Amino acid sequence: NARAKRALVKREAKLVENVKQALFIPGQSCNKNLHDIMVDLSALKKPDMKRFNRKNDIHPFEDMSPLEFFSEKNDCSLMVLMTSSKKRKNNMTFIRTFGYKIYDMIELMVADNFKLLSDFKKLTFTVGLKPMFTFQGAAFDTHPVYKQIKSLFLDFFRGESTDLQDVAGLQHVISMTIQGDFQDGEPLPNVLFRVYKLKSYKSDQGGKRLPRIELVEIGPRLDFKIGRIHTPSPDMVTEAHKKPKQKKNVELDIMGDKLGRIHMGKQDLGKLQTRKMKGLKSKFDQG
Amino acid sequence: LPVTVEKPIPVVYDLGNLAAFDSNVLDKNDLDSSNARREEKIKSLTRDNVQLLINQLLSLPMKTTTESVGGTGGQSSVMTLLQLPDPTTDLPREKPLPKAKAMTKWEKFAAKKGIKPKERAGKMIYDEASGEWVPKWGYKGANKKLDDQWLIDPRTLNRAERKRLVKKNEKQQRRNMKN
Amino acid sequence: GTGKKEKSRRIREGDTKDGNLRVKGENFYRDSKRVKFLNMYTSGKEIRNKKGNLIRAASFQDST
Amino acid sequence: KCDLVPTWVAAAWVKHLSKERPTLAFHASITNSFGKGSLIQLLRQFSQLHTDRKQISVGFIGYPN
Amino acid sequence: EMFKVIKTGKSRSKSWKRMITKHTFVGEGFTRRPVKMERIIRPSALRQKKANVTHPELGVTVFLP
Known part of the structure; x- marks a missing residue:
């Protein structure tokens, strides 16, 4: 069935890219209030979201691969991670992927x-x-x-x-x-x-x-509360802002006529010597 | 009732994403959780920013149409839609540009030899025998003639030759993305 | 000189794999498409044989 | 024949004809021309505008003499 | 029958230029390519700009571009 062929096309790269889907991942330490903020913020995002509903043993600053795998399998680029600890209470780690590798972590903890x-x-x-x-x-x-x-x-x-x-x-x-x-x-x-x-x-x-x-x-x-930050590699940042790439003296006139402005230069007629011809010569005076 | 509210540093706009970025001076002592006038302060400040944003936004150029309601995929005649510019702020793309598709050896052949790509006239070609237009390929294509034509079996021979030319086409294409 | 033979030139500019495509009069001064374009001024002459039949007709003359 | 009039007459005529059609003062002489460079630049711009058309033909029109 | 052979040269010895004997629609920004590089001749007289089209349903014929 060629339903899948459409799905691969919708996933693969485009000149004018789709809306960036968000994935809300609950980690092992997803307490109830964090699930509440996740419901609320994800609601603020929808219809472009997916919420995963199981605990996930993901530590986004020690093994970044599982996030890349989930950004592959779910076409979602943006991601969110539910974590809490005695060090970082009510933490949301906001992911960003470019291609499918990681472009950004960030570590925002929610104050009580x-x-x-x-x-x-x-x-x-x-x-x-x-x-x-x-x-x-x-x-x-x-x-x-x-x-x-x-x-x-x-x-x-x-x-x-x-x-x-x-x-x-x-x-x-x-x-x-x-x-x-x-x-x-x-x-x-x-x-x-x-x-x-x-x-x-x-x-x-x-x-x-x-x-x-x-x-x-x-x-x-x-x-x-801002925490640890993953900054993209400067090569990835300079390659992630590529314009899709879709003239001098040529203007699309209103009503759609290609018009060229022609720009001739100066005409120093002072450097022109008129023909010194016999009539203008006062030496051939008469009278 | 005032609407013309100002502040010492001007506000930049990114009307493509409907954003207004403020850059004025904020005091910690007005914002921290000790201050119980915190929420009112923030609401007023963001109201001011929204007020300037909407002032610029409603003062945009705006297009209105004359198409009936039962039109196709557009706006109706009654509603006047603001025409937003491109987003000024530069934001990271999701995936790299799709340029990664390469260039094949047939194309180099067609660029060396003076080949001009075919016109796409259509699937149907005139079957001069039966006075019909029969497609070249596909559903009862004009290449699936010998399969049930009423004259070892030569029909299977054609079918095998044709199928292995299909195999050859796939075999050649699968070596082109190794280029 | 071996460096000015045509096989040498073909080796130097990396177009050795293209023998099936190579037109007759291609050389240093003329690419293949240059040869075809300059064959324009000569074309249009049909080829008859001693029998007087048509090997092929002219370039834009055809009785089909 | 722009060398057969005073300088001010040539200037006035280019001023008045440029209001209709882009004109160019010119005195034609293989050794002592005037306006040769300006015409070369103008034709070269005209070729620049038609880069899609790889030959540009410039025809000359007027009375016989 | 479409193409009429045109000879060139002092002895009428070259025969590459071709002249279309039928009517042609030639476009809106057409220019004649230089005679040295001009094979297919489309004479200006046989260039058609309008055709009078008959509407079958409405039964009227109108001179349409």
């Missing part, structure tokens, strides 16, 4: 003050919806760990890329802020993940066009 979905109220909302992001804190643009976490969360929750967006679907914002500004040598403020639902009220400042928007907290109030 987290709140779930069920701790809040809910309004009308639609699952599988494209979220809008806000990233507070200047260190996201600059600091290597914070650049890594910003790209991590964008790549995790951006869903399917689109060029036309329905204003009805702008229904919730994912907000991520660093605990505070800091200098080099101070220990890495933990990042604050919050999910907010949008509400728009009329405001007649700019007119009918732009409303005033105010937020309501829904869902996973999480605080993320």
